[PDB]
């Protein structure tokens, strides 16, 4: 009653219509707490034994006399009839309201007060009675075992009181009822007063909506679903005995093994035969083609090129050139251009090097850095060269040793020239002592270092000429005191010529256009060569990529050998890396991709290495580099095959671990950019593959009939045909038997399976999910011309919502779009995004059906994650660990077989492991095989409605319309000679646009379904093998991870000599057991043969190329986990930070690069390598934006502070420590600087600290944007500088649906939608339109557009791309304005407060959180934030639907308020405080995965200590 007086007292002062929605929520909640507590306390005083606080069920049992060990044992048990399948451990922790113990009788009474007494009683009974009855039964079972002296009886009661308390005397007869009734009716009157008067009228509706949804949907429910009555399938009669008999008949004969024994002689013979075949089926060439994009040489140290030095170098270089005698038309062009450059005027010279802002047009110079060259002063040879230029397969003799000598000598000479020597933080100590000493100081004196810097300067000049207005003119540049000269022709592809002095370096004399002599000096003039933008960008960062690859190889060498590489080895590795980086060719990329699978194929007992070797000869060998690489691979593979200590691919060292050898080739493959993939050679290949598989499917349909191909063939048909066991066909009995075998293990967790399936939220709206409004590709609509548009899924979502009056759920959307035929096409390479996976994009209905199937199958398969399929986290290793431990335990034994009487034959148990890509999607698969599968699979639901929906979706994804690309159409229309295989491809498409494809789902997301199907087939194989040989204790296990699978076969071998075993096998054979012919020798071979045949019965073909068999697991502990999103090597992340930068501005480009480096560190990269990558990326960024010291936009040149005291958006550099970036974050440097400035100014009134504060205030004034969770950029807490952004030629569709002012107002008045996705149709439309206009979204959608790619390359050093006073100005103007503002700035109390607010072994996969989450906080942080900011009824409904526990939100809000006041020390109730500190909580909510080596736990401190330990490469520093 005292709490009621308290609440009434603090209700009295508030006038009606002044309390907010949340405050009214809290008032109502604690009023309900008091009114419940009155009855609870009265029952406690009358009958309950807990007078002070509620007690847990486990503690009640302990008090009642139940021993603790029995409770601990029972905690592992799961309640069978519990609706959620709760275990007894969780059941013990929850606290009933009242309990009493009388001898052996434990009586529980729960207190609830509600209008519907029966509903509350039923809810409490469902919560308590099932678990309590299970506990009582278990206690009786233990009593029967004698572990409990007396049996315990547990009874549960519910006392449910009406809202007016009229039934309290009937529910609980006591003499104190009248006072309780008076008190609770006073509470009810106060509740009515609060609900009806104290809330604002504009919020009132929301309140009742809350009051409807915070309770059990009293008067707010829709339930309009009515899942349609789709037809299912009737289970046919399938008997395991038929399959057993078929296997007996199949094994009675001899079957060919699908793999070959690995021997050095076999590999050498296969290589020789492939070479002989290749050299006779290709047109033979005697002249290797060019492979060096830039040819140059260096004899002295190279200084970076400057504008002043460039002029002098060009002058002296042209003076040298004019003294030469041309002999080729290219040399004539060179001489003409040099003569033109010499004959320019003084003002021409001034305007040539003048920046664009200071540039002035002239009769000879039209653009800066370029000059005009008319045809009048060109010579006849120059005109002929131009005319041949603008008016535009064979193989080398790899078998002949002459080409061997020539190519090997050339590449060895180039490498030898490259490797020739030319004439503080705790991390800093280790870096300067290990990495600087052994890597930087050695590679710094190499010729390749200066060659790479010269290459960077050359590529920078080429990019500078690549502008739209500059590509129409000629250009000349010089480098290294006139020793290198570059000529640019009027170029899309840019064309250039390089003239250098002959010397050590990148010289290929046989591919040079000519060599000129002027005495003792030789000048090599190369051919005019054309290069595109992607290769130019790859060349620009060639030095950085080579250095990163060398650092990674250094780290791996130290990890393997335990010491440091010698000088010559590291120099050779760097030379190889640089040579590979400078030569970007598709053939090299394919060769190195093939090597990643060739290496395991030769280091194991059996493999499919002939096919992999054959794949090396699929493309012609044109350059000498390809021959050298191929020969090095040949030698390495022959040595590896003869070795069954691992030789190194790059040097003369030998590794002790196979993972280092894998890492070498992985780094080699990742040295090649992804921009060269997807060209118009790989798209036609995929088109032809898909068309060929579709045509084969059509042929099988014509042969056996459509019904047999679609519904599968019968077993007796297989017994009479024996050709039906082929890919694209499946046996119904096999599918049903696999389903039964999987049900054998799925039947023990029916409740868990049903709960998991129903937890997928088949009722929540389709388009309110992040996966349906992402940036992934999608197929649009059939245009007028008849082609299929390539759009983005967000655009299609907007289009659908425009014509739809509501946001349908998944099942409803499937209902509306059920009759639309599925369509698919190949993604356009110019519209690919980062989130795109695969090459096929489908329409919206296809994605809906695939999502239905994927959700259903993932829900089913999650419940066996401990046994066969690994997803992630704790269950990512349990399946593999269990399989390996069981295999080892079984192998640690002997087998005994009874031949006759008690005499036994002894057998030694051996193991063999097979790794196969069984799960991987194949273009020749049949989806209809799933229809009979899910029809028989057991899900535990009480009805088949959802199962029938899944079956119907699988039926509707059977037929697809595959559309051919416009580019391929134009290319096929181009050539005059059509190949016979091209003719069939065209005949596949009847209208020239689309063709029907059946069976294949075209890379649709069905990975979990395929994995489950493969697991079922493996279980079927295990069962049938057990049935075949009951007397043999054969062993079989398997595991699946992503697309890979590992099978362990434990077989028996004859001990001593093989005499009794063959005798027993024969005796079985004459006994009628013909299937014992296969078990004679190498029983594992027959095991795998039967397993492969059974898998083929389900149309799963084990790849005869990439499958690896060995008696041990060396290639299987790495490849099995390779492919996951967490096992990705850090080399790709490190190399990707130097390219594909957002180009959104200096600050966020630097943030993206540093975040990529931090992520690479999290993937297992050494701290020193990560620091080097950070340094390289920042150097590149500062060079690009011109903020590096000594350059134009250096902050120190226009600010009164040092470079380290400048905010990052104003050209600052940040912490520059990878350890501080990983722990604190990217933007914590600004907060630290602001904290230092605040502390200095508030305690010493220092002028410079005030200047820093003024700089921060100016940054805040420039741009103060609110955080949106869909922004792909980096959010700045203390403001940012707005930069000019790429403008596409045509804006995306629907981007202009709403004006910018309307979207700004909508964002201002809807703060909740900055953290949650709206559920209503109109709100979702506005949200999606606003997202479509976000600059970080527009930039991401046009990531691969050529215009954006060129725009990112342009140096922003002298471009007006900064926003200031509503005008576009250069960066230094912004810096000057910032300085002027900071000079005349005075601190104010509001600014003071705002500033204070703004500042406040074995490899495993531990996942951590930056600051973790409070255990009291049950819902997600964004849900709680949306709850706090929600005002409108619609947004509150969206929050309530989004939250996992809508009832417990005010509790979470109060908990977060208390936590903020504890650690941050701020109060939430004040305005705008959350608008400032919410992004901090959002980032802290997210969790990050780190690859850690050791026994490190999941807490942040443990991983920090692990990184401290790994600070040193060689020695432990604990």
203 DSSP assignment: H
Residue 1440 neighbours by CB under 8 Å, 6+ apart: 210, 213, 214, 1446, 1449
- End residue of a domain, out of 196, 213, 230: 213
* Cα distances (Å, whole numbers) of residue 1301 to 795, 1160, 1297, 1314: 21, 40, 12, 17
Residue 201 and residue 302 in one domain: no
Q: How many helices (H) and strands (E) does the chain have?
A: 60, 33
What is the CB-side half-sphere exposure of residue 958 using CA atoms within 13 A?
18
| 948 domain-assigned | no
Helix residue spans in 1114-1227 (DSSP H):
1116-1119, 1130-1136, 1146-1162, 1167-1185, 1218-1223
> What distance in Å separates the CA atoms of residue 542 and residue 1176, rounded to the nearest whole number?
12
In the 3-class helix/strand/coil scheme, how is 508-551 assigned residue by residue? CCCCCCEEEECCCCEEEECCCEEECHHHHHHHHCHHHHHHHHHH
* CA 1358 to chain CA centroid, nearest Å: 37
What is the CB-side half-sphere exposure of residue 1014 using CA atoms within 13 A?
29
Decide: helix, strand or coil at residue 898. Answer: strand
Task: Convert 49-67 to b/e letters by CB count within 10 Å (16 or more is b).
Answer: ebeeebbebbbbbbebebe
Strand 646-647 and strand 654-655: pairing? antiparallel
| 1438 domain-assigned | yes
> What distance in Å separates the CA atoms of residue 50 and residue 59, rounded to the nearest whole number?
12
Helix residue spans in 937-1038 (DSSP H):
945-956, 966-974, 980-988, 1007-1028
Helices 21-46, 1450-1459: axis angle to 10 degrees equals 100
> What distance in Å separates the CA atoms of residue 965 and residue 970, rounded to the nearest whole number?
9
> What distance in Å separates the CA atoms of residue 919 and residue 1013, rounded to the nearest whole number?
9
Residue 76 and residue 172 in one domain: yes
Decide: helix, strand or coil at residue 153. Answer: strand
764 DSSP assignment: S
Burial grade of 768 (CB within 10 A; 0-12, 13-18, 19 or more): buried
Residue 47 neighbours by CB under 8 Å, 6+ apart: 98, 100, 109
> What distance in Å separates the CA atoms of residue 771 and residue 313, rounded to the nearest whole number?
56
Helix residue spans in 656-749 (DSSP H):
658-670, 682-704, 706-711, 715-721, 732-746
> What distance in Å separates the CA atoms of residue 1060 and residue 1069, rounded to the nearest whole number?
14
> What distance in Å separates the CA atoms of residue 54 and residue 47, rounded to the nearest whole number?
14
Q: Are the C-beta atoms of 1036 and 1087 separated by less than 8 Å?
A: yes
| 1464 domain-assigned | yes
Helices 1007-1028, 732-746: axis angle to 10 degrees equals 90
> What distance in Å separates the CA atoms of residue 473 and residue 491, rounded to the nearest whole number?
8
Which strands, in side-by-side order, build the sheet including 153-161? 98-102, 105-113, 153-161
Task: Convert 399-426 to b/e letters by CB count within 10 Å (16 or more is b).
Answer: eeeebeebbbebbeebbebbbbebeeee
Q: Are the C-beta atoms of 446 and 291 separated by less than 8 Å?
A: no
Residue 187 and residue 320 in one domain: no
Q: Are the C-beta atoms of 335 and 322 separated by less than 8 Å?
A: yes
For residue 1329, give the nearest of 801, 831, 844 by alpha carbon: 801
> What distance in Å separates the CA atoms of residue 451 and residue 458, rounded to the nearest whole number?
10
- End residue of a domain, out of 197, 213, 229: 213
* Cα distances (Å, whole numbers) of residue 952 to 293, 412, 815: 56, 63, 11
Phi-psi region of 730 (alpha: psi -120 to 50; beta: other; left: phi over 0): beta
> What distance in Å separates the CA atoms of residue 340 and residue 354, rounded to the nearest whole number?
19
Cα-flanking dihedrals φ and ψ of residue 1026, to 5°?
-60, -40
> What distance in Å separates the CA atoms of residue 194 and residue 384, rounded to the nearest whole number?
93
Residue 101 neighbours by CB under 8 Å, 6+ apart: 49, 60, 63, 64, 107
> What distance in Å separates the CA atoms of residue 1068 and residue 252, rounded to the nearest whole number?
12
Residue 172 and residue 297 in one domain: no
Q: Report the DSSP beta bridge partners of residue 1364.
A: 1367
Q: Are the C-beta atoms of 1028 and 244 separated by less than 8 Å?
A: yes
* CA 340 to chain CA centroid, nearest Å: 54
| 1351 domain-assigned | no
Residue 1451 and residue 1372 in one domain: no
Decide if 124 is catalytic. yes
> What distance in Å separates the CA atoms of residue 271 and residue 161, rounded to the nearest whole number?
87
Strand 903-916 and strand 1044-1054: pairing? antiparallel
Q: Are the C-beta atoms of 355 and 1358 separated by less than 8 Å?
A: yes
> What distance in Å separates the CA atoms of residue 35 and residue 183, rounded to the nearest whole number?
8
| 1493 domain-assigned | no
| 119 domain-assigned | yes
Which H helix or E strand runs over 158? strand 153-161
What is the CB-side half-sphere exposure of residue 742 using CA atoms within 13 A?
28
* Cα distances (Å, whole numbers) of residue 1013 to 697, 757, 847, 857: 21, 18, 21, 10
Question: Total structural domains in the chain?
Answer: 4
| 851 domain-assigned | no
Residue 306 and residue 375 in one domain: yes
* Cα distances (Å, whole numbers) of residue 1300 to 888, 1269, 1329, 1330: 66, 19, 10, 8
> What distance in Å separates the CA atoms of residue 1226 and residue 1217, rounded to the nearest whole number?
10
Phi-psi region of 1145 (alpha: psi -120 to 50; beta: other; left: phi over 0): left
DSSP letters spanning 1229-1286: HHHHHHHHHHHHHHHH--HHHHHHHHHHHHHHHH--PPP-TT--SPPPTT----B---
Residue 161 and residue 303 in one domain: no
The boundaries of the domain holding residue 345 are 293-391+470-540
Q: Are the C-beta atoms of 1414 and 1296 separated by less than 8 Å?
A: no
> What distance in Å separates the CA atoms of residue 1483 and residue 593, rounded to the nearest whole number?
37
Residue 1330 neighbours by CB under 8 Å, 6+ apart: 1298, 1303, 1306, 1307
Sign of CA dihedral 1213, 1217, 1219, 1224: negative
- End residue of a domain, out of 516, 540, 564: 540
Q: Are the C-beta atoms of 482 and 324 separated by less than 8 Å?
A: no
785 DSSP assignment: S
Q: Are the C-beta atoms of 38 and 1 separated by less than 8 Å?
A: yes
Q: Are the C-beta atoms of 549 and 572 separated by less than 8 Å?
A: no
Q: Are the C-beta atoms of 1262 and 1276 separated by less than 8 Å?
A: no
766 DSSP assignment: G
Residue 1387 and residue 1425 in one domain: no
Other Cβ atoms within 10 Å of 1475 Cβ, number: 14
Q: Report the DSSP beta bridge partners of residue 995.
A: 962
In the 3-class helix/strand/coil scheme, how is 205-237 assigned residue by residue? HHHHHHHHHCCCCCCCCCCCCCCCCCCCCCCCC
> Angle at CA 1210, nearest 5°, toward 1204 and 1214?
35
Residue 1388 and residue 1481 in one domain: no
Task: Convert 1327-1358 to b/e letters by CB count within 10 Å (16 or more is b).
Answer: bbbbbbbbbbbbbbbbbbbeebbbbbbbebbb
> What distance in Å separates the CA atoms of residue 671 and residue 545, rounded to the nearest whole number?
7
Residue 1383 and residue 1419 in one domain: no
> What distance in Å separates the CA atoms of residue 545 and residue 551, rounded to the nearest whole number?
10
> What distance in Å separates the CA atoms of residue 1436 and residue 1431, rounded to the nearest whole number?
7
> What distance in Å separates the CA atoms of residue 75 and residue 62, rounded to the nearest whole number?
13
| 1269 domain-assigned | yes
Decide: helix, strand or coil at residue 1122. Answer: strand
Q: Are the C-beta atoms of 583 and 625 separated by less than 8 Å?
A: yes
- Which pairs with CB-CB distance under 8 Å and at least 24 residues apart come from 81-88? 81/130, 81/133, 81/134, 82/130, 82/131, 82/134, 82/751, 83/126, 83/130, 83/751, 83/755, 84/755, 85/749, 85/751, 85/752, 85/755, 86/131, 88/131, 88/134, 88/135, 88/138
Residue 73 and residue 139 in one domain: yes
Residue 65 and residue 147 in one domain: yes
Which H helix or E strand runs over 1396? helix 1389-1398
CATH code at 35?
Answer: 3.40.91.60
> What distance in Å separates the CA atoms of residue 801 and residue 1324, rounded to the nearest whole number?
8
> What distance in Å separates the CA atoms of residue 712 and residue 724, rounded to the nearest whole number?
10
Q: Are the C-beta atoms of 443 and 574 separated by less than 8 Å?
A: yes
Q: Which entry of 12, 44, 59, 124 is annotated as an active-site residue?
A: 124
Decide: helix, strand or coil at residue 1207. Answer: coil
């Amino acid at each position: 009653m005292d709490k009621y007086r308290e609440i009434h007292n603090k209700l009295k002062e508030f006038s009606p219509g002044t309390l907010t929605a949340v405050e009214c929520i809290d008032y109502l909640d604690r009023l309900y707490a008091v009114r419940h507590d009155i009855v609870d306390q009265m029952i406690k005083h009358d009958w309950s034994d807990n007078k002070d606080s509620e007690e847990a069920i486990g503690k009640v049992l302990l008090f009642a006399g139940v021993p603790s060990n029995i409770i601990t044992a029972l905690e592992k048990k799961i309640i069978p009839n519990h609706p959620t399948g709760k275990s007894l451990k969780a059941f013990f922790k929850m606290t009933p309201a009242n309990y009493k113990i009388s001898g052996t009788t434990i009586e529980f009474v729960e207190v609830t007060v509600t209008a519907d007494v029966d509903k509350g009683i039923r809810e409490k009974k469902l919560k308590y009675e099932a678990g309590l009855t299970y506990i009582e039964q278990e206690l009786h079972k233990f009593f029967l075992k004698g572990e409990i002296p007396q049996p315990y009886k547990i009874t549960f009661n519910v006392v449910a009181v009406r809202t007016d308390g009229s039934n309290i005397t009937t529910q609980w007869p006591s003499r104190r009822n009248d006072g309780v009734v008076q008190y609770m009716r006073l509470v009810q009157a106060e509740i009515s007063y609060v609900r009806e008067h104290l809330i604002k009228t504009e919020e009132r509706a929301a309140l009742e909506a809350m009051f409807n949804l915070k309770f059990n949907i009293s008067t707010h429910k829709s339930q309009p679903y009515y899942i349609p009555d789709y037809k299912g399938m009737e289970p046919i009669g399938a008997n395991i005995e038929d399959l057993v008999d078929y296997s007996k008949d199949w094994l009675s004969r001899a079957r060919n093994f699908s793999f070959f024994e690995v021997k050095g002689t076999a590999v050498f013979e296969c290589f020789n035969s492939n070479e002989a075949n290749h050299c006779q089926r290709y047109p033979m060439s005697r002249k290797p083609r060019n492979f060096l994009l830039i040819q140059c040489s260096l004899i002295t140290s190279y200084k970076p090129a400057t504008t002043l030095s460039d002029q002098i170098d060009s002058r002296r270089a042209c003076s040298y050139i004019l003294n030469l005698i041309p002999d080729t038309p290219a040399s004539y062009l060179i001489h003409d251009m040099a003569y033109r450059y010499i004959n320019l005027t003084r003002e021409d010279m001034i305007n040539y090097y003048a920046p664009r802002i200071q540039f002035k047009q002239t009769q000879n110079v039209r653009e800066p850095g370029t000059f005009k060259l008319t045809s009048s002063m060109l010579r006849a040879e120059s005109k002929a060269m131009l005319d041949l230029l603008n008016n535009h397969i064979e193989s080398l003799n790899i078998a002949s040793h002459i080409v061997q000598s020539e190519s090997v000598s050339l590449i060895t000479k180039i490498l030898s020239d490259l490797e020739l020597n030319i004439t503080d933080t705790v991390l800093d100590k280790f870096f300067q002592n290990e990495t600087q000493k052994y890597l930087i100081d050695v590679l710094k004196k190499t010729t390749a270092w200066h060659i790479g810097h010269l290459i960077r300067d050359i590529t920078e000049s080429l990019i500078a000429h690549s502008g739209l207005k500059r590509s129409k003119y000629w250009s000349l540049h010089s480098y290294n005191n006139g020793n290198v000269i570059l000529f640019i022709l009027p170029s899309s592809f840019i064309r250039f010529i390089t003239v250098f002095r002959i010397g050590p370096g990148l010289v290929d004399k046989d591919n040079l256009d000519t060599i000129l002599i002027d005495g003792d000096s030789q000048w090599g003039v190369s051919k005019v060569m054309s290069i595109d933008l992607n290769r130019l960008l790859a060349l620009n960062i060639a030095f950085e990529k080579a250095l990163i690859a060398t650092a990674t190889w250094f780290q791996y060498y130290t990890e393997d050998q335990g010491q440091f590489p010698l000088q010559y080895a590291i120099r050779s590795v760097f030379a190889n890396h640089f040579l590979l980086a400078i030569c970007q060719k598709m053939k090299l990329c394919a060769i190195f991709d093939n090597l990643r699978y060739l290496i395991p194929a030769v280091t194991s007992l059996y493999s499919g290495f002939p096919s992999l070797i054959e794949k090396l000869f699929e493309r012609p060998f044109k350059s000498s580099l390809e021959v050298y690489i191929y020969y090095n691979i040949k030698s390495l593979l022959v040595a590896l095959a003869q070795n069954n200590v691992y030789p190194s691919f790059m040097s003369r060292i030998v590794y002790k671990h196979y993972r280092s050898l894998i890492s070498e080739v992985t780094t080699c493959f990742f040295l090649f950019e992804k921009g060269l993939h997807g060209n118009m050679n790989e798209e036609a290949k995929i088109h032809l593959e898909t068309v060929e598989w579709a045509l084969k499917f059509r042929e099988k349909e014509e042969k056996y009939g459509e019904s047999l191909v679609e519904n599968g063939y019968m077993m007796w048909e297989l017994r009479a045909n024996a050709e039906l066991a082929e890919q694209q066909l499946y046996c119904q009995d096999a599918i049903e038997l696999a389903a039964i075998e999987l049900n054998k293990v799925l039947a023990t967790k029916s409740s868990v399976v049903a709960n998991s399936i129903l937890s997928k939220n088949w009722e929540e709206p389709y388009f309110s999910q992040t996966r349906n409004i992402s940036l992934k590709g999608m197929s649009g609509q059939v245009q007028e011309d008849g082609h299929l548009s390539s759009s983005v899924t967000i655009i299609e979502a907007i289009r659908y919502l425009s014509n739809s009056r509501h946001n349908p759920s998944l099942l409803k959307l499937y209902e509306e779009t059920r009759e639309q035929k599925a369509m698919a096409r190949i993604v356009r390479k110019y519209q690919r995004t980062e989130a795109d996976r695969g090459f096929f994009i489908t329409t919206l209905p296809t994605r809906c059906r695939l999502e239905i199937i994927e959700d259903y199958y993932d829900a089913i398969a999650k419940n066996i994650s401990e046994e066969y399929i690994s997803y992630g986290g704790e269950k990512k290793i349990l399946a593999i660990q269990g399989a390996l431990e069981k295999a080892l335990r079984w192998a640690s034994g002997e087998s005994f077989i009874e031949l006759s009487n008690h005499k036994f034959i002894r057998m030694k148990r051996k193991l063999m492991y097979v790794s196969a890509d069984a799960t991987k999607w194949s273009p020749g698969d049949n989806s209809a095989k799933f229809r009979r599968f899910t029809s028989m699979l057991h899900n535990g639901l009480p009805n088949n409605k959802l199962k029938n929906c899944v079956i119907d979706a699988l039926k509707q994804v059977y037929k697809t319309d595959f559309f051919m690309s416009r580019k391929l159409r134009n290319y096929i229309d181009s050539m005059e000679s059509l190949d016979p295989h091209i003719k069939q491809f065209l005949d596949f498409f009847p209208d020239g646009h689309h063709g029907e494809v059946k069976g294949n789902w075209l890379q649709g997301n069905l990975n979990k379904c395929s994995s489950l199907f493969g697991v079922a087939m493996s279980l079927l194989f295990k069962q049938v093998w057990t049935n075949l040989f009951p007397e043999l204790d054969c062993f079989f296990e398997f595991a699946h991870h992503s697309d890979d699978a590992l099978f362990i076969y434990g077989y028996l071998e004859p001990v001593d000599d093989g005499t009794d075993w063959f005798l027993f096998v024969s005796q079985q054979i004459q006994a009628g057991h013909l299937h014992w012919f296969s078990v004679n020798t190498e029983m594992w071979k027959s095991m795998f043969n039967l397993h492969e045949h059974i898998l083929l019965l389900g149309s799963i073909k084990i790849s005869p190329k990439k499958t690896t068999v060995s008696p041990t697991n060396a290639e299987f502990l790495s490849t099995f986990f390779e492919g996951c999103a967490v096992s990705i090597p850090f080399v790709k992340i490190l190399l990707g930070s130097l390219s594909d930068l957002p180009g959104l501005g200096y600050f966020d480009d630097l943030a993206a690069a540093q975040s990529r480096c931090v992520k690479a560190l999290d993937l297992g990269a050494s701290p020193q390598v990560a620091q080097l990558a950070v340094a390289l990326c920042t150097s590149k960024v500062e060079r690009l934006y011109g903020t590096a010291p000594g350059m134009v936009n250096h902050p120190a040149a226009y600010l009164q502070v040092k470079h380290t005291d400048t905010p990052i958006p104003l050209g600052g550099n940040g912490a520059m420590s990878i350890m501080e970036l990983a722990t604190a974050g990217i933007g914590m440097s600004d907060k630290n600087l602001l904290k230092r400035a605040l502390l200095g100014y508030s305690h010493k009134r220092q002028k410079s600290m005030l200047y820093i504060l003024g700089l921060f205030k100016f940054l805040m004034k420039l741009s103060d944007e609110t955080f949106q969770h869909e922004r792909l950029g980096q959010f700045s807490f203390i403001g940012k500088v707005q930069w000019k952004i790429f403008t596409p030629k045509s804006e995306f569709e629907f981007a202009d649906m709403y004006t910018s002012k309307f979207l700004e107002l909508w964002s201002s008045q809807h703060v909740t939608y900055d953290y949650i996705i709206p559920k209503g149709r109109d709100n979702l439309l506005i949200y999606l339109v606003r997202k479509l206009n976000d600059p970080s979204i527009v930039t991401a959608m046009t990531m691969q557009s050529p215009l954006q790619l060129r725009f990112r390359m342009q140096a922003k050093q002298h471009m007006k791309v900064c926003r200031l006073d509503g005008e576009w100005v250069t960066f230094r103007e912004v810096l000057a304005a910032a300085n002027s503002f900071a000079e005349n700035y005075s601190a104010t109390s509001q600014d003071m407060d705002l500033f204070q607010t703004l500042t406040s072994r074995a490899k495993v996969a531990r996942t951590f959180t930056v600051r973790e989450k409070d255990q009291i906080i049950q819902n997600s942080i964004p849900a709680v934030i949306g709850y706090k900011f929600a005002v409108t009824v619609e947004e509150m409904s969206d929050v309530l639907d989004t939250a996992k526990f809508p009832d417990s939100l005010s509790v979470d809000l109060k908990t977060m308020k208390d936590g903020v006041y504890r650690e941050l020390g701020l109060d939430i109730s004040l305005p705008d405080v959350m608008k400032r500190i919410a992004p901090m909580l959002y980032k802290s909510s997210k969790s990050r995965v780190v690859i850690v080596q050791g026994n490190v736990e999941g807490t942040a401190e443990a991983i920090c200590r692990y990184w401290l330990k790994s600070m040193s490469l060689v020695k432990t520093i604990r």
